[PDB]
From a paper:
Eukaryotes possess eight highly conserved Lsm (like Sm) proteins that assemble into circular, heteroheptameric complexes, bind RNA, and direct a diverse range of biological processes. Among the many essential functions of Lsm proteins, the cytoplasmic Lsm1–7 complex initiates mRNA decay, while the nuclear Lsm2–8 complex acts as a chaperone for U6 spliceosomal RNA. The Sm family includes the Sm, Lsm (“Like Sm”), and bacterial Hfq proteins. These proteins share a conserved “Sm fold” consisting of an amino-terminal alpha helix followed by five antiparallel beta strands that form small beta barrels that assemble into ring-shaped hexamers or heptamers. Here, we elucidate the molecular basis for Lsm-RNA recognition and present four high-resolution structures of Lsm complexes bound to RNAs.
Since deletion of the carboxyl terminus of Lsm1 generally enhances binding affinity, we therefore crystallized the Lsm1Δ56C–7 variant of the Lsm1–7 complex bound to the U-tract RNAs UUUUUA and AUUUUG and determined their structures to resolutions of 1.8 and 2.1 Å, respectively. In the structure of Lsm1Δ56C–7 bound to AUUUUG, all nucleotides are visible within the electron density map. The path of the RNA around the interior of the Lsm1–7 torus is a right-handed helix, with the phosphodiester backbone in the center and the nucleobases splayed out into binding pockets. The six nucleotides of the RNA make an almost complete turn with the last nucleotides 6 Å below the first. The 5′ adenosine interacts with the noncanonical binding pocket on Lsm5 by stacking on Tyr39. The 3′ G also interacts with Lsm5 by forming a hydrogen bond to Asn66 in a manner that is similar to the interaction observed for the terminal adenine of UUUUUA, except the asparagine side chain donates a hydrogen bond to the guanine oxygen instead of an adenine nitrogen. The structures explain why oligonucleotides harboring these sequences bind with nearly identical affinities to Lsm1Δ56C–7. In the crystal structures, the 5′ end of the RNA hexamer is nearest the “proximal face” of Lsm1–7 while the 3′ end is nearest the “distal face”, the same orientation as in the Sm ring where the bound RNA passes completely through the center of the torus. Lsm1–7 binds tightly to the sequence AUUUUR, and this sequence is highly reminiscent of sequences found in 3′-UTR regions that undergo adenine/uridine-rich element (ARE) mRNA decay.
Author numbering:
A (entry chain F): 3 to 73
B (entry chain A): 15 to 83
C (entry chain G): 24 to 108
D (entry chain D): 1 to 82
E (entry chain C): 8 to 57, 68 to 92
F (entry chain B): 1 to 93
G (entry chain E): 5 to 79
The structure:
RNA sequence: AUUUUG
């Protein structure tokens, strides 16, 4: 499964998550599940271009995810 | 369930803001509704006007609420 | 499917997607999930403000249409914009 | 009598479909399924603002795009009687 | 090992929740399920409007999971 | 069905349902099903003048999917038993 | 012509993805799954309202919003 | 992955 192989090859690395709203999250991908729910370590949140938040750990509900991109 | 409202006059508020007033005839497990003798009531502040509309089948996902009258 | 897509095989059809995008194209293939293959596709572009059509089109060639986002399918032959009946 | 049973019983008769974005489709119900997917014949498509109109010989409507359906009261009577 | 564990380990903790409609919650997580429905106790809500923020307080608040964007455990 | 049971325990108590369309309805919870559809009785609409069409409504049904929040007054027994139940599900399921 | 076979024939080549919103992606198709979530590499992302473009080395695109998949990439 | 967990 191509999506699963990509995810397994970026787990533990730093990724860009874009949500359908366009809000961005940069962080270390801990794990994901079948709904594309995500767990991120060391997370920076970006609205438009500005960093708005940081989280040591963040749960992202998978229905919001537009894409997961290697950094 | 909605069986308690069957054959009663109800107002149905839809997600797009419409107010339908009619007799609830039936429903199913999606809360799809079937209404008879329905009017659509158009509000501007506290004033309203009615439009006769007949029978509706309302898709459940668009139903915000159903109120007994 | 209640729609027998083979009746449109090699005819131009109009497709509308959830969100408002509209295209036309010549039906070359489909599956049971209503994914389509359309050829000579043209997209009717919309105004960013009103969401209404502008009259401008763009060509897109051979396109795979996702059945999950299809909301409307209609043959082009017999269609016409008309005045308020 | 369930909503979708009424819908199946409306096959062959006029129907009004309003989509979630306010477009309306007037025409004869050709077919329908349990998703509420519809096929209509002899269709008038009215755009949301009520501005532009179109005629379509037939069309397919995916069920999860529908806001509501309107049918003639006479249909409900004649279906109750049968 | 799975993302929902972050929520599991956050039980009885003050969590931060980001919700659709420009809403934010801060509150003690008392329960949740696989939809991310949850109940928060002693919860503050920040509603952002376009700039300006409205603050609200709830003794006990059920949140439907389909509005949830992000959950963050406490620091 | 954790929250279905929680809401069962709130039956005949007062709650306030905030809909995703921003309306808020206070009333007595009379019913809840597996989809978290709720029935309220003796309702009162917050900012009622803004929603004139609700003035003549006494009882109502609300589809679970349009609910944003249900909020109510706290009770310690409620809170600790709810947390206990969540932990019980997590040990079991 | 079966739609998904055409997509599979595009693996290794350029593919232009058009979302329901004013957003597009064009890049080399690495692969896809049963819901046509898509892995693209050496990708350009387009905001077709602002005209801003971004680059990505490799990404998994959620198939939920995809209206159109155009083999051969974008002109 | 076609209405109550997008």
């Amino acid at each position: 499964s191509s999506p699963n192989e990509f995810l397994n090859k970026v787990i533990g690395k730093k990724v860009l998550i874009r949500l359908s709203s366009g809000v961005d999250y940069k962080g270390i991908l801990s794990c994901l599940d079948g709904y594309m729910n995500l767990a991120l370590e060391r997370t920076e949140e970006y609205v438009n271009g500005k960093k708005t938040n940081v989280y040591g750990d963040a749960f992202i509900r998978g229905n919001n995810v537009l894409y997961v991109s290697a950094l | 369930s909605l069986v308690d409202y069957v054959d009663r006059k109800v107002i149905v508020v839809l997600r797009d803001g419409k107010k339908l007033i009619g007799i609830l005839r039936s429903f199913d497990q999606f809360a799809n509704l079937m209404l008879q003798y329905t009017i659509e009531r158009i509000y501007v502040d506290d004033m309203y006007g009615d439009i006769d509309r007949g029978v509706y089948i309302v898709r459940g996902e668009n139903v915000v609420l159903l109120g007994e009258l | 499917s209640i729609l027998d897509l083979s009746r449109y095989q090699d005819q131009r059809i109009q497709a509308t997607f959830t969100g408002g995008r509209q295209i036309t194209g010549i039906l070359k293939g489909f599956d049971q999930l209503m994914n389509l293959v359309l050829d000579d596709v043209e997209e009717q572009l919309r105004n960013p403000e009103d969401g209404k059509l502008t009259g401008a089109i763009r060509k897109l060639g051979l396109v795979v249409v996702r059945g999950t986002t299809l909301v409307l399918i209609a043959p082009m032959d017999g269609s016409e914009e008309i005045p308020n009946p | 009598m369930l909503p979708l049973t009424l819908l199946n019983a409306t096959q062959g008769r006029p129907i009004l479909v309003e989509l979630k974005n306010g477009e309306t489709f007037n025409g004869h119900l050709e077919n329908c399924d349990n998703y509420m997917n519809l096929t209509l014949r002899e269709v008038i498509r009215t755009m949301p603002d009520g501005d532009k109109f179109f005629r379509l010989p037939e069309c397919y409507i995916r069920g999860n795009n529908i806001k509501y359906l309107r049918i003639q009261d006479e249909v409900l009577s004649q279906v109750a009687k049968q | 090992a799975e993302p929902l564990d972050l929520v599991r380990l956050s039980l009885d903790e003050i969590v931060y929740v980001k919700l659709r409609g420009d809403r934010e919650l801060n509150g003690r997580l008392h329960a949740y399920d696989e939809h991310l429905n949850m109940v928060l106790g002693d919860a503050e809500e920040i509603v952002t409007i376009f700039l300006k923020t409205i603050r609200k307080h709830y003794e006990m608040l059920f949140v439907r999971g389909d509005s949830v964007i992000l959950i963050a455990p406490p620091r | 069905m954790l929250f279905y049971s929680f809401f069962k325990t709130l039956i005949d108590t007062e709650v306030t349902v905030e809909l995703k369309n921003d309306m808020s309805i206070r009333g007595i919870l009379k019913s809840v099903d597996q989809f978290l559809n709720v029935k309220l009785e003796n309702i009162s609409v917050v900012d009622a003048s803004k929603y004139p069409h609700m003035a003549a409504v006494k009882d109502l049904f609300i589809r679970g999917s349009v609910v944003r929040y249900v909020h109510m007054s706290s009770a310690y027994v409620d809170t600790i038993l709810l947390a206990d139940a969540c932990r019980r599900d997590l040990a079991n399921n | 012509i079966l739609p998904l076979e055409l997509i599979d024939k595009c693996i290794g080549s350029n593919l232009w993805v058009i979302m329901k919103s004013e957003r597009e992606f064009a890049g080399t198709l690495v692969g896809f799954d049963d819901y046509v979530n898509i892995v693209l590499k050496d990708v350009t992302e387009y905001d077709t309202v602002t005209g801003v473009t971004e680059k990505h080395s490799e990404m998994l695109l959620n198939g939920n919003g995809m209206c159109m998949l155009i083999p051969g990439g974008k002109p």
